[PDB]
Amino acid sequence: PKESDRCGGCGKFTHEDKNDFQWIGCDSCQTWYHFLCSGLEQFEYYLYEKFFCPKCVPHTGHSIRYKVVAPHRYRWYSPNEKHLGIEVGSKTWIEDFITRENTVPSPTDDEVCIVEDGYEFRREFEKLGGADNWGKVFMVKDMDGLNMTMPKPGFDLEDVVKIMGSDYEVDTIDVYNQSTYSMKLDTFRKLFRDTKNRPLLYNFLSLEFSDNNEMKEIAKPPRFVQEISMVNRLWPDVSGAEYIKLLQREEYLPEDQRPKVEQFCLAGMAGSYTDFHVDFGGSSVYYHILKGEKIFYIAAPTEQNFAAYQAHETSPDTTTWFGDIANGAVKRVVIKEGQTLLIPAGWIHAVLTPVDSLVFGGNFLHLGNLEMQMRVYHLENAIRKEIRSEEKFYFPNFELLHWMYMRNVLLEKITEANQEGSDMREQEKNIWTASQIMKAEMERWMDRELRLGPEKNAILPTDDKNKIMISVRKQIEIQTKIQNAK
């Protein structure tokens, strides 16, 4: 081939390969570099008008970044978008938004319930039917009572990067561009320390640390969350005889299959803004502000609001804030240092970060919200039919998780029930109704799979599924025959 076309380097024509297959040219020496060999991290790929490779920087100066020409646009650098409208949430949009931000209505007592501590939460949570009837959002002022393991105050980003590693790569939002890129934790810290100079804002929401032996012990979900978590139910963190018995039955599940979404760490700069959405899979959320402050803008999961949200999301429009077209559905709820927010399935929400913040939270699925979860799933699929998105923004192995839950959990219980008496409505009415609901949804999945084959990759052979569905139908019909008898 040709020498000029050789990184870089790396000194090779083809990278070992995520580099993808992308290079960048040096506006000095003119030699090409594979992106992964340029010295740039993903978040810089679009920042520089003139890129100067490491070989040339001490004698050519740093790289020159585009002039901020359209601060009201995601492409704030493209002079062509100067005349175009203000986009939510460009720098221009967020600034303005902050000034009127507090005019948005507070919630009704039916919507959010504020409690002083976890003990009061427990009592109010129980009054409303508990987790199986959980439909409203809770804000807890003081964690005492929640059994939620958290770092002692004074703990901060500095401790996070030390434990996780300075080279650890986290997915970060470029707020003003409203996109996400990779950034070394170290690189985030440096920018986060520089409070007085911040051309662009950064805020990472996706830092899952359930696989870090040190971290996963410093910040855990509340006990009640752990108890109802479906992911937890399937991939128990047990040991010895327990784990062995868990193996003897084919109830073992690969760690690389587990959805890692229950232990997130979030850090964000003041002026950060994450736009409206529903957490993937219609998952519920715990959310604890260790430092800083967060303002959530929430709307109940009603059919009217879903219709509005679905339109909002599929609409190519970019200038219209969801709140303005939601008919007073959006409410304002502030969370401050030390406080905790508990959101059940379906809630549409946006969030403003008025102040540099460090948060620990997590997403989970639970039987109590099975319908709403499936409703949200439908919502995601409906939206996907129009726009094209990545898969790392939706609930990982959502369908597999249910196949496993049905087979490993619900099915075994209906069976044991069936083997004695035994009316499940007597001491397991909640399990039974979840089974019928999950089965209904799975039947559709099966049908769909037979009407156009499986998907791509893996994992559960159509054969296996069908075998499972045959088993579930049998036990379910048996149980219904028992009930009809009584």
Partner: peptide, 6 residues
């Protein structure tokens, strides 16, 4: 910035 993909 001048880039490329192969």
């Amino acid at each position: 910035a001048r880039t490329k993909q192969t």
